[PDB]
Amino acid sequence: LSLVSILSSAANDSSIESEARSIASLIASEIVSKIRSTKDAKSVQEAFDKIQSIFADGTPDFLKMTREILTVGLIPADILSFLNGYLNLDLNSIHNRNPSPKGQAIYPVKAPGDARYSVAENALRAAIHIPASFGYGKNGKKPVILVPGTATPAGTTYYFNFGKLGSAADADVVWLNIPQASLNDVQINSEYVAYAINYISAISESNVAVLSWSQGGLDTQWALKYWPSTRKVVDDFIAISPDFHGTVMRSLVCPWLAALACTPSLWQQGWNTEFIRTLRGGGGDSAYVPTTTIYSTFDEIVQPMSGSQASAILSDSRAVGVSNNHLQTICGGKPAGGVYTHEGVLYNPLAWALAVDALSHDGPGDPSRLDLDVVCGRVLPPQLGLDDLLGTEGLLLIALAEVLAYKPKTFGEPAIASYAH
Ligand SMILES: [Ca+2]
Numbered sequence: 001l002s003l004v005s006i007l008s009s010a011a012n013d014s015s016i017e018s019e020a021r022s023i024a025s026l027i028a029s030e031i032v033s034k035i036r037s038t039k040d041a042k043s044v045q046e047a048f049d050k051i052q053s054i055f056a057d058g059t060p061d062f063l064k065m066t067r068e069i070l071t072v073g074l075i076p077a078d079i080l081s082f083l084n085g086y087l088n089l090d091l092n093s094i095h096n097r098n099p100s101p102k103g104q105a106i107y108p109v110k111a112p113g114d115a116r117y118s119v120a121e122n123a124l125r126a127a128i129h130i131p132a133s134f135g136y137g138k139n140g141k142k143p144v145i146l147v148p149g150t151a152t153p154a155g156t157t158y159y160f161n162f163g164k165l166g167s168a169a170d171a172d173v174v175w176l177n178i179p180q181a182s183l184n185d186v187q188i189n190s191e192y193v194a195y196a197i198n199y200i201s202a203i204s205e206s207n208v209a210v211l212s213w214s215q216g217g218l219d220t221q222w223a224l225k226y227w228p229s230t231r232k233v234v235d236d237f238i239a240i241s242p243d244f245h246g247t248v249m250r251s252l253v254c255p256w257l258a259a260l261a262c263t264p265s266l267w268q269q270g271w272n273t274e275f276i277r278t279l280r281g282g283g284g285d286s287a288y289v290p291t292t293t294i295y296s297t298f299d300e301i302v303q304p305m306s307g308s309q310a311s312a313i314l315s316d317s318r319a320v321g322v323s324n325n326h327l328q329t330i331c332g333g334k335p336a337g338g339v340y341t342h343e344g345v346l347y348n349p350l351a352w353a354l355a356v357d358a359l360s361h362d363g364p365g366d367p368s369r370l371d372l373d374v375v376c377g378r379v380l381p382p383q384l385g386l387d388d389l390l391g392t393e394g395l396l397l398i399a400l401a402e403v404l405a406y407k408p409k410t411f412g413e414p415a416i417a418s419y420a421h
Contacts, residue, residue: 003085240351292364
């Protein structure tokens, strides 16, 4: 199967809403037609000019952003070809062959007080992609777990951004390919994060760091809350565009898809859901470990992502250290404080500088320790280029394919797990 086949099937799928079928058809036909060109971005500034053209009538929603990404010709053929074969890509595998962990048992229960796992150990461990270059904390490199966002596999997501964190920090990346691309129940998705934390810490005999994107923040926060043993081994939680309070919708429709029939994780990411309320209760709205949140006003998925009520904000009632980093505040009226989408924060220079600063100091990332004139003056971190910007934007095409192919669709959020009340 391919991105083209999934979207062509969705275009001919009677269960899907008229507008989404048209977008799927347009995208499937635009990919096969495009498979460099005159319309392609010749530079990084040209890529941003195309993004700013999409934002000309205001911040779009998920469906408008995804449709316009191809209309403006932001994704070149070579990147489209790579994104098209994401399902068969080894980096996105949920069937990785990892050895049994040594030392104290981490399954079924690492420590009293941890929530029971509903997922089998073999399935949890197989979701972890450990690169052959991983040093198991024997080389002075801190293991960093890359947690994916909604409808997008980790492997492809981080290939174009933080998969390269080791080039900027003393970080040894691993990524978690959550089955069904994080579209199932967030409570189930979180188990993969909780297990990955305790597993990577065990094999490395070291504390770890977690870097998450989008829903990845919710998966990590839930794992930290309900598996307290994970809190002791996580030194830094770097959250890119996190929706710790979910997101609002103008109409009575789900986040992302904006329909009546969606997926469990789409429905759970609503502002006033039982999921969000359950997570935020008992201090779940405060950090569990040093947390560095990084978010943008121009987030087309999550709102509000500015002001005092921003979804990304965590309080610090436990006194573990928290920094809530709003791009348009820290880099106000500067290139790094520009039009950075929900996915765009993954290639933001301030996001990278904060991630590096967080990993090199006790506590979270601190903008006061950075040379903000240099950092805010950039459009991309020195570690990333044009293809990284374009590829990260191209993820929306995979996110749409995964959302549309998800079956059976649901009209509401699932029941709250017994351990959470
Ligand atoms: Ca730190």
